[PDB]
């Protein structure tokens, strides 16, 4: 089956927060193609701008990026069901099977590693815990500016939330009974320390 280099794919997948800020600014470095000038804005400047622009601007950008992730998950789910063919039913036998399918297949196909353990309250919310979170393994600012790090990577954490929300959609529950939130509250408990210090937790609730 055909393949593509993982490096270029990860580079494209990281290149959504600069998209999300730049397109929003366009709705709201001069350069020539062949005869007409087009403005190009450097990618790294847009992450700074998204950090320090506005609360409503940030909310709009995050919603847009969540929509991108939703589309990715919605389109990917059908092909995964056609190929791997899990033992799920349409609406709900139990949410544990659905989340097990997501963990075993979706993260295997998108990222290079199976997502780690997951909590289960057995009635309400599910916590998906991921250690070292591949697409930001080489993301840093400064030796001292550590608190800025967590607050300014936060927009990058929306695309997997969108992916989970989309995969939940087209599988029964729609995007009105499902609320999902990402956070950095995870610790590197006992695994070897990687580049990035903090883990990722996906708090997803359905009803």
């Amino acid at each position: 089956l055909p393949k593509v280099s993982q490096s270029v794919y990860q580079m494209l997948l990281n290149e959504m927060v600069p998209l999300a800020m730049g397109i929003e600014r366009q709705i709201s470095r001069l350069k020539i193609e062949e005869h007409h000038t087009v403005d190009i804005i450097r990618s790294h400047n847009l992450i700074h701008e998204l950090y320090k622009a506005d609360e409503e601007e940030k909310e709009k950008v995050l919603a847009r990026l969540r929509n991108i992730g939703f589309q990715i998950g919605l389109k990917l789910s059908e092909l995964l069901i056609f190929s791997n063919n899990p033992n799920l039913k349409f609406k709900e036998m139990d949410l544990l099977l659905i989340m097990k399918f997501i963990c075993r297949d979706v993260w295997k196909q998108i990222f290079g590693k199976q997502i780690d353990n997951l909590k289960t309250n057995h009635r309400g919310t599910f916590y998906l815990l991921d250690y070292d979170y591949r697409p930001i393994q080489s993301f840093s600012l400064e030796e001292d500016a550590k608190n800025e790090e967590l607050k300014m990577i936060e927009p990058f954490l929306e695309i997997p939330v969108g992916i989970i929300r989309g995969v939940l959609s087209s599988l029964g529950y729609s995007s009105e009974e499902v609320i999902c939130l990402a956070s950095f509250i995870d610790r590197p408990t006992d695994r070897p320390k990687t580049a990035f210090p903090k883990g990722v937790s996906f708090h997803v609730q359905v009803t």
Binding site: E78, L79, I81, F82, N85, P86, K89, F90, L171
Partner: protein, 140 residues
């Protein structure tokens, strides 16, 4: 093997497409047959596969000179119903496998059209047009 009609229905019993590969009022007959077949899925009369996690083809029934098979996609809830003539079936095992293969091609076409990254959110007319031209390309 030339199917008489191919019908696609979603979870919510909404027919996407009841295309017939063109007699003028046979569309009514085929659409009635599709409506009749729609209720067989939620019925204890027929035991669905539910084994090894593979879609299974079933000869759901035959009315008025149309042997009609159907497949249920338990994961998504999609429902394919396709009919054939009696005159064009010899009832061999290889024919059954071929019919399963044509069901697989239909499902492939449906998935590939739905995953088009220009469908806005739910514009049904575009889906009908795309599936219709694809089915014209295949069944010809």
């Amino acid at each position: 093997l030339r199917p008489c009609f191919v019908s696609l229905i979603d979870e919510s019993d909404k027919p996407i497409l009841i295309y017939v590969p063109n007699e003028m009022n046979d569309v009514l007959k085929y659409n009635v047959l599709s409506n009749i077949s729609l209720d067989y899925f939620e019925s204890a009369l027929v035991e669905w596969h539910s084994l090894d996690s593979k879609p299974l083809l079933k000869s759901i029934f035959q009315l008025e000179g149309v042997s009609v098979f159907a497949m249920l996609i338990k994961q998504t809830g999609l429902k394919i119903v396709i009919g054939f003539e009696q005159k064009s079936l010899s009832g061999a095992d290889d024919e059954f496998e071929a019919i399963n293969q044509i069901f697989e091609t239909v499902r492939k076409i449906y998935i590939r059209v739905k995953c088009n990254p220009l469908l806005v959110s739910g514009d049904e007319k575009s889906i009908i047009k795309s599936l219709e031209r694809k089915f014209d390309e295949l069944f010809i």
